[PDB]
């Protein structure tokens, strides 16, 4: 009869009212559910004490807050209103680099994870430049190349760079409509030897992340907080005992 | 709630032409206006207020409405038989010398006994003191230390017929209302 | 408040003829006051007996303090008269800490350093006594006194001066096409507006659709202006400009 | 004459005014009663101070706050505006699993506490699948079934799953009207050697839970805070000294 | 000339203006008196510094806060707007218990401190039930009796219970009008070797308790905080040096 | 050129503008002076920034806060708007005690510091009661007399009490007008070897005490905080460099 | 490329737009500069995302806060809107002391730093009083003299005191117009081996001190905080690269 | 799938929409991105609850906060709305010092980094002053020259000073329009063994610095906080999944 819950959360996107495919939202650190109700009060005056005598609720709402520490592309799409984009690994052959280059300049490539970089001199007779004359910063992960020096007989300034770029996953920002996800919390109550507890939420409308600290200080992992309001599902039976906002299941 | 007092006059006929205006005192008299508020705190008080409202019959029936200011303060004790009340000079003689709207006095002693008097004529005595007169006697010897206020009286009647009795709790409870009284020339003159 | 009358009638074309009526604008003053210790009763009696009749209103904005003591019976008060509402044959009113410590004298002429007097002063006030220019005034409306306590009443007194207020009329130094030019830069503390008023009447809205005919086909812009004095000279210059304007009559 | 209270609390629902069956509210950590009174003041002004002279109470209301740590279904119904639902244990024979199933997918069953799970292959000759080709995550506490592998001769994709489910208790969200419960507190006062003390609240209207941390961090047991206002009961005698909100009994 | 006060507080209820009988308010932990005054400010402008020049008070009020740790019935009546009710010890002979009783049910009696409990079977031949078949919870202080078992030949379900109940003191809530109490603080100033100090408060209107935590956590005794406004007594002389709100007496 | 001030403070009441007799304000723990100035700003717009260009102060006010730890009657009069009352020691002969007196009751005398208490019985033959039948609580510091017992032949109930009372000093509440006191501070600056520093405030209007903890908890001496505004004195020369609010003198 | 600045601040008063003589503001503990800008936002709706699309600044302001620990008369004049007054050392010969003096009275002299005090008896034959009959408190720094006793043949009560007073420096309060000072901060950046950094502020309008604790508690030196707004200088070139509010100079 | 980011940031100004030259923003301590969305809600009422049923986002905005510790002139220009000014080293020959110079005065030169200072006396026969008669405070870092003494035959007062000044970089205040900079962040995720992560912000409008503590107290390096809003770029494809505010790239 005591609660100290830990466990897993599953979400299923709702598109045009048809249930989607459920997925794990990865590690989650905190979940809380808050209930708010608005009431109109009726009073009676026969006693002369001017005190409350009746109250009937009018408003009914619920909100859910979730703190997830996963920066996976699927969770990013869920929270950033984005859609995942998959780019396959490929090669570049004739990319043109900026002109008027000199030692100390930093050039950037349109793709990341560059490898086998080759820069061909612009001339009637191609002449690849010496590797010693350029360097790759951050092991070519940022697509940045630094010039270490140029030969005394300055070659043709425009350059043609060819290399290989690895596959990557991209997420847009505000590129997707307000997701509607059904949440299934499956937690274990340690206070009762690990008793099973299940919480069901039929329809939840999420709110984009409030903050995201890219550069973190201290020993605390970056946290993503998302707030959402549990909407009223109109498909479940009205007289059905299961309700229309959520549910709790306890085995006993 | 802070209340207000105003001196409404029949000051019409300003005759504002093109060069400059000019105002003529048709009567040269000022009728003061006083606001009033009260709290019931009981059935008897509310019944008494309702009876008073019914007796008023709007603006028809008049009744004196004493102010609650401290316009006059004594500066010298006065014998019981004396009728030469001394008060500090407030320009009363220059402005008030017996004419309706002024006059009428309520001593309101410390103990609680209140004497109603009638001013007859005010004479200037000094730049700081006067010798305003009364109608007849005072009742006893009262020193300046034993006077609370004077609170000039004035006959008045209601200014607005409509009266709002704001019931809050119950008949045996608290009610709020506001009343306004305006001076009127009545009482056989 | 400085108010004047100027009834102007314009023809179908955007041409105006102006007929300024009042040569001396009527001056109105609005202020709030208090009365607690011996001034409340005096105020009540003063507005009771005198009521609606000509007053001798001191000019509060023109307050002045004596630099040297004034000997009793002396003829002439040496004081600053630069940009002050002092006129030959006018009135002056010395004042003290209390209402009673006052006395009114008749000023003959202004010598730019003192006030020639015809009647000697019968009482001497030292440094600190206030000096007020005096102009005839009348109570436009009887103030509504707000009782603050047993002996306290705040009043909103408004006065109108029943004497012409002579003042030099001077225009801006700059001239363009034989007309004055307003070189003052308006204050931007409060955002201002500009509009193009047109004689666009006769819309003739019937039943099917409306139609508008440009009677003159000209737009006359409207501009708002604000300024800050920060000194006596600027205020005197503004008053001179206002007097020179004579309402809408004189353009610039 | 000193108070440090511990004890239990009993609540009885009120359904149309007829007293219900009292039940224990299980463990409770904090109970507070707050009284609020609104007053209208009368101020004299005869002393020159305008100080407060009189005041009579016009408003009267009492609020009670309770912190309970029990997640019992009865308390969930009392706090979540829900009604308990009891499902008896049973068996299933013809559930159909999602099609297009491959290794790595997770299947979810409509019931919890699954045991003796059997998956019969769809064909003219039934052929139950080998148990080693699937696994039960969380020992079948949620019907979550994970596919370990499939035979090289891929069998018929649609599956027919049969199993047994255990009985459970469910609570809906906002599925019941505003409960009205009378409260009886059983505080024992330790400061006086454990002196019994009684508090009864005739009519109390509760407010739904404010927060529920499903996943908790720290060494604190999950807490449930409920706010309620003590209504005025119209059935008790008016002149009776017992009052109409509540009362306190102290033997002695 | 330094203050660190401890001591006693006495109160006398004021009914219809007649002094009551003084009583001790038991232990008190904190007393504070706060003074509030409203002021209207008058300014003079001759200096150009736009600064305050005079101020006269208008409002005058005082409030007293008291923290008492006594839950005695008299103090409860003072603070809860209640009236003490004394119930004498007595006996019950024919109380009827609820029907359809079964083992495990908990029955409650209308009186506390039950002793010598006897339950007679309903039949032509009375047959008191065995004491072993029922138990008293909390030593019968809460009037709760638990059924331990029933004989195989189930006796008549309705029961008649007779017992003895002890005397008790009850306090209502909002059952009394706003008390008006005169307070006499008698404290000792330790900073001056224990010098005597007395504070007198003629008329005080109290405000019901703000909070009352029935279940306390920690090592802090339950505290009752009461706020009150010192009204203006109209019976004392106006010119009397003793004032009309309160007073302080110091021997020296 | 560094400041860490300690010293004393002197105050002289102002009664109609005539300087009073200076007195020490006893021990003080904190003195603060706050200056507040209101400004009206002029903004140009010729640079496209609309940035602040000019600003002239219009308001000017100074507030002074003092924390004193002295409960001397003079300071009480200065802080509580009271006036001191001195009662000379004397004797009483014919005080009548309350009737219907029994053991356990407490009697209160109109005077404090009672000694040589004698209670003469009412009868044709006076018979002073035995001292052992009554006790003096708090060594007669409040005239509190407790009855230990009464003789079996109950004597005449009404009593006539005679005793002696010591002299005392009393301070009323809000019994004096708003004091106006000039302040002189005598701070010695330790940071410069104890360099004398003088601060004088010509006119200060104080505000009644905000809080007074009669019963204190901890090891802190009771503190009294007073707030006051420095008014503009109209008597000092306007052109005098000494100003009209205050001034500071530093020898050197 | 890191900043941790310490150094000096110089100010030059601006009178009628002519640069004054720069002076050191003595030790300064904290300086901060804050920039505020107001912006009006334009949005475009073609995307349906109702998001910001453009923003152009409108307001431009800057404020500077300075914390100085120097109570020097020049800084006092700068911060208190005062003007320094120098009084030369001198002597007094015929100062008349208060009459009706008795032992225990404290007399105060109009000047500080009194020395060689001589009090001559008023009589036909002058007779200076014995030094043993009076004492000087605080070594005559506060101009306070205490009477220790008087001869049995009481001499003439009025007294004539002659002494010597030292020179002193005085500062008025609100006796000077709003100072306008140009600030030159010359600090050293320790993070770069003590690199030179200079900050220039052409025009700054200061705000009087917020607080000044004459009696300090703890080990923290008294601090003076001054706030000011950097106005727009209209004399510098508009297209000049140096700007019109301030500047920063770094050698490199 | 866990994030703890460190790395660098690159910014490129946008001048009329044409991409500028990327530059490193030097050391950065904190970067945060905040998303705000405004929603309009639709509430059904058919269930008697009036609970929220639907909600569609209408607003969309993103704010980015950056904390940088670099006082480089480029960052000052980017943050102070300034433009860098470069002054080449040079020499001066005919600067005229202030007249009426005496010992103890301090002279300030228009340029910094003064060296080889020579002061030639004004006379028919030039006579450079002896170096020992003047000193250079702060080793000539500010051209501050202090006079140690003057020869007994006081030479001609006006002086002609020649010296050399070093090159420097200057930044004005509010001398540049609102910068629009695209941001590229280069966070390396340590939680996954240093996994590269990319964040690009197409269009960001910055806000001037909020505070700058020139003189710092403690062991904290001076921090510069900048706030900016991510505008909507209209050049990128609308249907492109990359969005128009930003995007995140995670190799994998």
Short mmCIF file of C-alpha atoms in Angstrom, two decimals, chain D residues 12-173:
data_model
loop_
_atom_site.label_atom_id
_atom_site.label_comp_id
_atom_site.label_asym_id
_atom_site.label_seq_id
_atom_site.Cartn_x
_atom_site.Cartn_y
_atom_site.Cartn_z
CA UNK D 12 -17.64 7.64 4.88
CA UNK D 13 -19.04 8.69 1.49
CA UNK D 14 -22.26 10.71 1.40
CA UNK D 15 -24.57 9.68 -1.44
CA UNK D 16 -27.71 11.86 -1.49
CA UNK D 17 -27.33 12.56 2.24
CA UNK D 18 -27.55 8.99 3.55
CA UNK D 19 -24.51 8.02 5.60
CA UNK D 20 -22.28 5.46 3.92
CA UNK D 21 -20.10 2.70 5.31
CA UNK D 22 -17.02 4.03 7.10
CA UNK D 23 -13.63 2.85 5.85
CA UNK D 24 -10.06 3.43 6.96
CA UNK D 25 -8.08 5.80 4.74
CA UNK D 26 -4.91 3.78 5.41
CA UNK D 27 -1.65 5.52 6.31
CA UNK D 28 -1.65 9.33 6.47
CA UNK D 29 1.33 11.63 6.99
CA UNK D 30 -0.16 15.13 7.38
CA UNK D 31 -3.56 16.60 8.23
CA UNK D 32 -4.18 20.35 8.47
CA UNK D 33 -7.32 22.43 9.03
CA UNK D 34 -7.41 26.09 7.98
CA UNK D 35 -10.08 28.62 8.95
CA UNK D 36 -10.73 31.79 6.94
CA UNK D 37 -13.08 34.59 8.02
CA UNK D 38 -13.94 37.77 6.10
CA UNK D 39 -14.87 40.90 8.05
CA UNK D 40 -16.44 44.28 7.30
CA UNK D 41 -15.14 47.15 9.42
CA UNK D 42 -16.80 50.29 10.78
CA UNK D 43 -14.59 53.30 11.52
CA UNK D 44 -15.50 56.23 13.75
CA UNK D 45 -13.99 59.67 13.21
CA UNK D 46 -14.85 61.58 16.40
CA UNK D 47 -11.36 61.22 17.92
CA UNK D 48 -9.47 62.63 14.93
CA UNK D 49 -7.75 59.28 14.33
CA UNK D 50 -10.30 57.51 12.08
CA UNK D 51 -9.12 54.34 13.80
CA UNK D 52 -10.97 51.03 13.63
CA UNK D 53 -13.77 50.95 16.20
CA UNK D 54 -15.88 47.91 15.31
CA UNK D 55 -15.80 44.85 13.08
CA UNK D 56 -18.22 41.96 12.54
CA UNK D 57 -17.38 38.72 10.70
CA UNK D 58 -19.29 38.13 7.46
CA UNK D 59 -17.38 35.27 5.85
CA UNK D 60 -16.69 31.84 7.29
CA UNK D 61 -15.03 28.87 5.60
CA UNK D 62 -12.80 25.96 6.58
CA UNK D 63 -10.35 24.04 4.40
CA UNK D 64 -8.76 20.68 5.25
CA UNK D 65 -5.59 19.27 3.68
CA UNK D 66 -4.65 15.58 3.92
CA UNK D 67 -1.46 13.83 2.78
CA UNK D 68 -1.90 10.09 2.23
CA UNK D 69 0.71 7.60 1.01
CA UNK D 70 -1.65 4.75 0.05
CA UNK D 71 -2.22 3.77 -3.59
CA UNK D 72 -5.06 1.43 -2.70
CA UNK D 73 -7.81 1.28 -5.33
CA UNK D 74 -10.38 2.63 -2.86
CA UNK D 75 -8.20 5.68 -2.19
CA UNK D 76 -7.61 6.08 -5.93
CA UNK D 77 -11.38 6.12 -6.46
CA UNK D 78 -11.82 8.64 -3.64
CA UNK D 79 -9.03 10.87 -4.97
CA UNK D 80 -9.19 10.49 -8.77
CA UNK D 81 -12.99 10.84 -9.03
CA UNK D 82 -13.03 7.22 -10.18
CA UNK D 83 -14.93 4.01 -9.47
CA UNK D 84 -13.23 0.66 -8.95
CA UNK D 85 -13.59 -2.06 -11.60
CA UNK D 86 -12.91 -5.72 -10.76
CA UNK D 87 -11.97 -8.15 -13.54
CA UNK D 88 -12.04 -11.86 -12.72
CA UNK D 89 -9.29 -14.19 -13.88
CA UNK D 90 -9.98 -16.09 -17.07
CA UNK D 91 -8.58 -17.52 -20.27
CA UNK D 92 -8.33 -16.57 -23.94
CA UNK D 93 -8.31 -18.88 -26.95
CA UNK D 94 -8.56 -16.93 -30.22
CA UNK D 95 -6.61 -13.69 -29.98
CA UNK D 96 -5.03 -12.67 -33.30
CA UNK D 97 -1.57 -11.10 -33.25
CA UNK D 98 -0.41 -8.32 -35.60
CA UNK D 99 0.62 -9.46 -39.07
CA UNK D 100 3.93 -8.87 -40.87
CA UNK D 101 5.78 -10.01 -37.76
CA UNK D 102 9.57 -10.39 -37.79
CA UNK D 103 12.34 -10.91 -35.26
CA UNK D 104 12.87 -7.94 -32.95
CA UNK D 105 9.22 -6.88 -32.80
CA UNK D 106 7.34 -6.72 -29.49
CA UNK D 107 3.73 -7.88 -29.15
CA UNK D 108 1.31 -6.63 -26.50
CA UNK D 109 -1.65 -8.61 -25.16
CA UNK D 110 -4.93 -7.06 -24.04
CA UNK D 111 -4.57 -8.65 -20.58
CA UNK D 112 -1.86 -8.76 -17.93
CA UNK D 113 -0.43 -11.56 -15.82
CA UNK D 114 -0.13 -13.87 -18.82
CA UNK D 115 0.95 -17.45 -18.16
CA UNK D 116 0.92 -20.76 -20.03
CA UNK D 117 1.24 -18.78 -23.26
CA UNK D 118 0.67 -20.86 -26.40
CA UNK D 119 0.84 -19.60 -29.99
CA UNK D 120 -0.77 -21.95 -32.52
CA UNK D 121 0.27 -21.54 -36.14
CA UNK D 122 -2.43 -20.86 -38.73
CA UNK D 123 -2.68 -23.84 -41.08
CA UNK D 124 -4.84 -26.83 -41.93
CA UNK D 125 -2.69 -28.75 -39.43
CA UNK D 126 -2.19 -26.72 -36.21
CA UNK D 127 1.45 -26.63 -35.11
CA UNK D 128 2.18 -24.76 -31.87
CA UNK D 129 5.39 -22.77 -32.18
CA UNK D 130 8.43 -23.79 -30.19
CA UNK D 131 8.72 -21.88 -26.88
CA UNK D 132 12.40 -21.07 -27.49
CA UNK D 133 11.43 -18.81 -30.42
CA UNK D 134 9.78 -16.24 -28.13
CA UNK D 135 10.42 -14.70 -24.71
CA UNK D 136 8.24 -13.04 -22.07
CA UNK D 137 9.57 -9.68 -20.92
CA UNK D 138 8.82 -8.81 -17.29
CA UNK D 139 7.75 -12.42 -16.63
CA UNK D 140 4.51 -11.83 -18.50
CA UNK D 141 3.47 -8.96 -16.24
CA UNK D 142 2.25 -6.97 -19.27
CA UNK D 143 1.75 -9.58 -22.00
CA UNK D 144 4.88 -8.26 -23.69
CA UNK D 145 6.21 -11.02 -25.96
CA UNK D 146 9.52 -10.71 -27.82
CA UNK D 147 10.37 -12.80 -30.88
CA UNK D 148 13.75 -14.52 -30.62
CA UNK D 149 13.67 -16.03 -34.11
CA UNK D 150 11.63 -17.79 -36.77
CA UNK D 151 12.19 -21.14 -38.50
CA UNK D 152 13.86 -21.00 -41.90
CA UNK D 153 10.64 -22.30 -43.54
CA UNK D 154 8.74 -19.16 -42.53
CA UNK D 155 5.39 -20.39 -41.15
CA UNK D 156 2.01 -18.75 -41.75
CA UNK D 157 2.34 -15.15 -40.57
CA UNK D 158 -0.97 -14.68 -38.68
CA UNK D 159 -0.94 -16.26 -35.22
CA UNK D 160 -3.57 -17.41 -32.73
CA UNK D 161 -2.53 -16.86 -29.11
CA UNK D 162 -4.16 -18.44 -26.06
CA UNK D 163 -3.27 -17.92 -22.41
CA UNK D 164 -4.66 -17.14 -18.96
CA UNK D 165 -4.93 -13.72 -17.31
CA UNK D 166 -5.14 -12.94 -13.60
CA UNK D 167 -7.74 -10.79 -11.87
CA UNK D 168 -7.05 -7.09 -11.44
CA UNK D 169 -8.55 -3.85 -10.13
CA UNK D 170 -8.86 -0.74 -12.31
CA UNK D 171 -9.65 2.91 -11.58
CA UNK D 172 -10.79 5.39 -14.22
CA UNK D 173 -10.12 9.12 -14.48
#
